[PDB]
Design an enzyme around this catalytic site. Structure first.
Site, PDB file in Angstrom:
ATOM      1  N   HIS A  78      -7.693  62.252  17.672  1.00  0.00           N
ATOM      2  CA  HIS A  78      -8.402  62.629  18.744  1.00  0.00           C
ATOM      3  C   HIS A  78      -7.394  62.088  20.063  1.00  0.00           C
ATOM      4  O   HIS A  78      -7.430  60.636  20.226  1.00  0.00           O
ATOM      5  CB  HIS A  78      -9.925  62.158  19.063  1.00  0.00           C
ATOM      6  CG  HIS A  78     -10.629  62.984  18.114  1.00  0.00           C
ATOM      7  ND1 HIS A  78     -11.979  62.222  17.586  1.00  0.00           N
ATOM      8  CD2 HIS A  78     -10.403  63.993  17.429  1.00  0.00           C
ATOM      9  CE1 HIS A  78     -12.318  63.256  16.693  1.00  0.00           C
ATOM     10  NE2 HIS A  78     -11.577  64.245  16.629  1.00  0.00           N
ATOM     11  N   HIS A 127     -10.323  59.307  13.120  1.00  0.00           N
ATOM     12  CA  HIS A 127     -11.340  59.227  12.001  1.00  0.00           C
ATOM     13  C   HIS A 127     -10.804  59.439  10.518  1.00  0.00           C
ATOM     14  O   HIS A 127      -9.781  60.455  10.614  1.00  0.00           O
ATOM     15  CB  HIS A 127     -12.312  60.054  12.139  1.00  0.00           C
ATOM     16  CG  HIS A 127     -13.014  59.948  13.706  1.00  0.00           C
ATOM     17  ND1 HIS A 127     -13.889  59.427  13.986  1.00  0.00           N
ATOM     18  CD2 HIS A 127     -12.671  60.700  14.813  1.00  0.00           C
ATOM     19  CE1 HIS A 127     -14.151  59.512  15.465  1.00  0.00           C
ATOM     20  NE2 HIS A 127     -13.233  60.030  15.774  1.00  0.00           N
ATOM     21  N   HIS A 130     -15.271  50.381  15.378  1.00  0.00           N
ATOM     22  CA  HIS A 130     -15.472  51.754  14.891  1.00  0.00           C
ATOM     23  C   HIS A 130     -14.410  52.780  14.461  1.00  0.00           C
ATOM     24  O   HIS A 130     -14.421  53.751  13.725  1.00  0.00           O
ATOM     25  CB  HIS A 130     -16.742  52.577  15.487  1.00  0.00           C
ATOM     26  CG  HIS A 130     -16.272  52.665  16.960  1.00  0.00           C
ATOM     27  ND1 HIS A 130     -16.772  51.717  18.089  1.00  0.00           N
ATOM     28  CD2 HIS A 130     -15.837  53.700  17.671  1.00  0.00           C
ATOM     29  CE1 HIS A 130     -16.528  51.944  19.286  1.00  0.00           C
ATOM     30  NE2 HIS A 130     -16.109  53.240  19.068  1.00  0.00           N
ATOM     31  N   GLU A 173     -13.689  65.041  11.058  1.00  0.00           N
ATOM     32  CA  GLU A 173     -14.936  65.177  11.861  1.00  0.00           C
ATOM     33  C   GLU A 173     -15.095  66.724  11.843  1.00  0.00           C
ATOM     34  O   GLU A 173     -16.005  67.374  11.544  1.00  0.00           O
ATOM     35  CB  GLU A 173     -14.933  64.522  12.964  1.00  0.00           C
ATOM     36  CG  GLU A 173     -14.783  63.163  13.231  1.00  0.00           C
ATOM     37  CD  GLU A 173     -15.436  62.332  14.171  1.00  0.00           C
ATOM     38  OE1 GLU A 173     -15.097  62.761  15.092  1.00  0.00           O
ATOM     39  OE2 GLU A 173     -16.621  61.632  13.888  1.00  0.00           O
ATOM     40  N   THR A 180     -18.135  62.380  19.810  1.00  0.00           N
ATOM     41  CA  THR A 180     -18.588  62.259  18.315  1.00  0.00           C
ATOM     42  C   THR A 180     -19.067  60.646  17.914  1.00  0.00           C
ATOM     43  O   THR A 180     -19.369  60.788  16.850  1.00  0.00           O
ATOM     44  CB  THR A 180     -17.426  62.752  17.378  1.00  0.00           C
ATOM     45  OG1 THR A 180     -16.404  61.853  17.519  1.00  0.00           O
ATOM     46  CG2 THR A 180     -17.168  63.973  17.664  1.00  0.00           C
ATOM     47  N   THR A 181     -19.153  59.977  18.826  1.00  0.00           N
ATOM     48  CA  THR A 181     -19.686  58.329  18.705  1.00  0.00           C
ATOM     49  C   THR A 181     -20.760  58.576  19.767  1.00  0.00           C
ATOM     50  O   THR A 181     -20.330  58.738  21.030  1.00  0.00           O
ATOM     51  CB  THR A 181     -18.786  57.411  18.680  1.00  0.00           C
ATOM     52  OG1 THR A 181     -17.939  57.654  19.996  1.00  0.00           O
ATOM     53  CG2 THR A 181     -17.813  57.397  17.407  1.00  0.00           C
ATOM     54  N   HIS A 202      -7.310  57.919  19.149  1.00  0.00           N
ATOM     55  CA  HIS A 202      -7.784  57.221  17.933  1.00  0.00           C
ATOM     56  C   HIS A 202      -7.903  58.296  16.812  1.00  0.00           C
ATOM     57  O   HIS A 202      -7.662  59.304  17.203  1.00  0.00           O
ATOM     58  CB  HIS A 202      -9.227  56.631  18.242  1.00  0.00           C
ATOM     59  CG  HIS A 202     -10.002  57.536  18.582  1.00  0.00           C
ATOM     60  ND1 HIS A 202     -10.383  57.893  19.963  1.00  0.00           N
ATOM     61  CD2 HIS A 202     -10.819  58.257  17.800  1.00  0.00           C
ATOM     62  CE1 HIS A 202     -11.050  58.807  19.968  1.00  0.00           C
ATOM     63  NE2 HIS A 202     -11.657  59.070  18.394  1.00  0.00           N
TER      64      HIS A 202
HETATM   65 HG   LIG Z   1     -18.085  49.808  17.851  1.00  0.00          HG
HETATM   66 ZN   LIG Z   2     -12.778  60.717  17.819  1.00  0.00          ZN
END
Ligand SMILES: [Hg+2]
Ligand SMILES: [Zn+2]
Length: 258
Positions: free
Chosen positions: A117, A94, A62, A104, A196-197, A92
């Site tokens: 993040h 996004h 992801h 985000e 957020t995941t 990580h």
């Molecule tokens: Hg994943």
């Molecule tokens: Zn994140």
């Protein structure tokens, strides 16, 4: 039917397996800058990354995580809205399929090209797993990315991505200095929110910096060559791995700056 960012399994579906997706302090949110309130009670942000020990970079299907040794106080976040010490465990990003989207959080509805993040856990809970059982378990430093000039301190990340193209691949990633990803100013907004995941747990003190960093088009284009899929499977580019803004539900966003 595992969660992801496609039409079939994306953010609008997450609530079926993770009902907290419709909870009272979900992230991200739109930061309406005029209704935020300057908080003079906000102790000074201390970002102390001098002794950071990066270890590894992982494509988790992801995003990609740059992981740190969090067995001692080596890279920590203190002050601001936080009590005590929060240790850096990973960072990580996004990002979007296009430069016009990818963040985000939004700022007065404006989307940035990407969002970094830096994830930290509250040392009072001993490790990350215990921390995500707590309402003050995590602190995430969020930094917006816009496309412009290159960010030299990001290039080591960009260059290693070829070796973690697909889900489950990891590579050594020692001696990376996360100080090279910070903007000049530490002015920020803060509010209580969530992962957020999935599992979307409501554990996070969010600290979102006002000043973006600039990265080059070439740098973000390399992010977009990563794959959500595993090796040997049909290629599905890792793009648009962002959750959209969620309802604020009367939470107050505080500003560190007047
Ligand atoms: Hg994943
Ligand atoms: Zn994140």
């Amino acid at each position: 039917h595992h969660w992801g960012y496609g039409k079939h399994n994306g953010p609008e579906h997450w609530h079926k397996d993770f009902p907290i997706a419709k909870g009272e302090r979900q992230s991200p949110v739109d930061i309406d800058t005029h209704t935020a309130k300057y908080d003079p009670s906000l102790k000074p942000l201390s970002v102390s990354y001098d002794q950071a020990t990066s270890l590894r970079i992982l494509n988790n299907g992801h995003a990609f995580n740059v992981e740190f040794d969090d067995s001692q106080d080596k890279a920590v976040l203190k002050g601001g809205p936080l009590d005590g010490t929060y240790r850096l465990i990973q960072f990580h990003f996004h990002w979007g399929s296009l430069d016009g989207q990818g963040s985000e959080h939004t700022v007065d509805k404006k989307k940035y090209a990407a969002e970094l993040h830096l994830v930290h856990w509250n040392t009072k809970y001993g490790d990350f797993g215990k921390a995500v059982q707590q309402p003050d378990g995590l602190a995430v430093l969020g930094i917006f990315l816009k496309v412009g000039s290159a960010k030299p301190g990001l290039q080591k990340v960009v260059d290693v991505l070829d070796s973690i193209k697909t889900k489950g691949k990891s590579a050594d990633f020692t001696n990376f200095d996360p100080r090279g990803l910070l903007p000049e100013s530490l002015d920020y907004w803060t509010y209580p929110g969530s992962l957020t995941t999935p599992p979307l747990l409501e554990c996070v003190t969010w600290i979102v910096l006002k000043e973006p960093i600039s990265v080059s088009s070439e740098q973000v284009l390399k992010f977009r060559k990563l794959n959500f899929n595993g090796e040997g499977e049909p290629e599905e580019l890792m793009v648009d791995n962002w959750r959209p803004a969620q309802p604020l539900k009367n939470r107050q966003i505080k500003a560190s700056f007047k």
